[PDB]
Amino acid sequence: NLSGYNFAYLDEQTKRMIRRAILKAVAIPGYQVPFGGREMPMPYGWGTGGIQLTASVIGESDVLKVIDQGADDTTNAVSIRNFFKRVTGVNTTERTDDATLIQTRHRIPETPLTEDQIIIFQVPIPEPLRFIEPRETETRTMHALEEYGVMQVKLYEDIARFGHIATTYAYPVKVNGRYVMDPSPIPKFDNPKMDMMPALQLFGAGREKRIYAVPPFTRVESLDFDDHPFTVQQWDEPCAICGSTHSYLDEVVLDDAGNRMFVCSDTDYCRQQSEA
Amino acid sequence: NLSGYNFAYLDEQTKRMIRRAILKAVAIPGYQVPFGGREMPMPYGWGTGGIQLTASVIGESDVLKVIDQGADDTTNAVSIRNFFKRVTGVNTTERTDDATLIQTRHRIPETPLTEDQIIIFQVPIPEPLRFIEPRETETRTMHALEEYGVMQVKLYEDIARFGHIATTYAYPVKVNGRYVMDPSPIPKFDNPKMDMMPALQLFGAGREKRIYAVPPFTRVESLDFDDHPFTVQQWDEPCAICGSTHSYLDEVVLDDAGNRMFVCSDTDYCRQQSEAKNQ
């Protein structure tokens, strides 16, 4: 408890409202449950929806793991981890194995998520079809109408415009076989990991104030065509540190002339492999 | 008589520049002469231009009269007069006829000014076309070419909308038959007093960095139409104090009920009328 502040930095009213919204979202997998909180200014862009969920669901006994693009060394991830250490005092770990709360931005950890874990995803936009439908009045109703063919248009025309499905980030999915949800801009590599995961996944968008959750062991399938099944391009380049190419690789720039290298995005799995 | 500051609080370079500006303004009656105005102890828009003009002009032998809204008892007038006393230590009078330098805000004294008197005006907006044209880059050329037709169009539009000219104070004048000059924010009631006056008229826009002047016995003609002549403010009541009927009156709401009393803005003239029997 930070002096002068509530536990987890949020007033209990916002916590209670977000908790009620989380319960409704769990009872309705894939549905972007609205919640009517206030406006909270934060320095780092990440947090308008993820920090709120973490504060709503974090407890004194939790172990927090903050991840930015899979990494824990990121400046924003370190800042958020320190912020939650200050306002909650929870323990923090660098291992997906020992973590009980994993706040991540645009990345699922390589390590399988076990039971008694919650993973929170920051969602810049909670409705994928905002790029097509400008007015939200039809967007809400078409979910009940099940008119999910409109979002299939971009998938259909991606191959026409480029020859292959290039939507490797924020690829839409259908969860529970009913609700079309768009996760955070996680890579196509991690989209399979959402299929019947042992852990409870929470998605929170702040600038839109919509929450949706994926209960553990919930069937979520990538949206594609039978003639063009959802496939993830295998990686043919290794990691410059541990070498293993079984994990999604991000790029780190080393110089001002464009020089760079590929390293495992999930630094925890990278360290696990390196120490092997 | 100065308490550390130079006489009149301004250094000699500043006063010399202001003096050159005043001479140019007198040589070009009605034209706004730019000058390097300095920041004064009074905030911009509180009479800094008039203060600087008086500091440049005033001498030890002058009797300074500072009136705001026609009265010497106004808070701003009190402050300006006290500042000049501190920095110059000159004689200060409330009688217009006894004064040598008169610094006014929004009023021309009811008492006619004599030959050797200089009256200095505080001007917020030296440009008479500022409200029609906010940009100085355009009004400077409009004054260069004498393209004053837009002011006449403004008066025409006022007549069309209301049937009367909307401007009531700061009523634009034509000076020496050439320059459309903005007077101080004086009532149009005072506009006729500027015509062929035997006193020198100075106009200081301290925040806007402009000085202009009207020499003695200079034609001053308020703008108007032939079928819509120039008319002055008039009240159905005399002064509640001196019974005057030719002085610019002002309202003083007495109680919440709505009881009014009209009394002279020019308090010196009011006192003159009160002591000399009543009007």
Partner: protein, 193 residues
């Protein structure tokens, strides 16, 4: 050696400016500048007072060759720090005597229609402020009419009577004779009677 300046520079400059302002705002009025008791010869008392009370670093001064002495230049750039130019067109305060020529008069700066005050002031030293051609003055500063007979050169008389430079352009003339000073701004209508 250098010519001295005002004994009381602040008070003397203020009084000189007030006299000059009286002369300028009421053209045709002769005023006496009794604050400086010895002008910078060839410059007389009134011209020296005008220069001391108006000239400074910002105002280039052009002295006509008859008046362009050495000690006067030294004292002028020491007491006022005013730049000393060699051509009439570069001057803010032109100083000349009866020997003024038409070319010099027309070279001076009359200002611009947008900046009419960016012109020059001609400080002319005349043989006398009376006894010349009888001149009638009308305009701003003159109630009904004024009569003055200064001994003006023919070129300056033509300038005043004809005004080749339309208002607001023109040169403000300051006639000086000893301690006495007369002013004709560019807005004064002058006829030779």
């Amino acid at each position: 050696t250098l010519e001295t300046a005002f004994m009381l520079p602040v008070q003397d400059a203020q009084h000189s400016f007030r006299r000059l302002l009286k002369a300028m705002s009421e053209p045709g009025v002769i005023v006496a500048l009794h604050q400086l008791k010895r002008g910078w010869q060839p410059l007389n008392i009134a011209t020296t007072s005008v220069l001391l009370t108006l000239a400074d670093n910002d105002t280039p001064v052009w002295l006509s060759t008859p008046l362009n002495n050495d000690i006067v230049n030294q004292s002028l750039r020491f007491h006022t720090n005013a730049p000393l130019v060699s051509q009439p067109e570069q001057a803010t305060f032109a100083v000349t005597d009866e020997a003024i020529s038409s070319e010099q008069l027309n070279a001076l700066s009359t200002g611009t229609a947008v900046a009419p005050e960016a012109g020059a002031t001609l400080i002319l030293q005349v043989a006398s402020l009376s006894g010349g051609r009888m001149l009638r003055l009308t305009g701003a500063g003159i109630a009904e009419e004024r009569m003055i007979a200064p001994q003006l050169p023919e070129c300056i008389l033509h300038e005043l009577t004809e005004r080749p430079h339309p208002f607001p352009l023109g040169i403000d003339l300051i006639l000086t004779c000893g301690e006495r000073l007369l002013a004709i701004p560019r807005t004064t209508h002058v006829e030779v009677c």
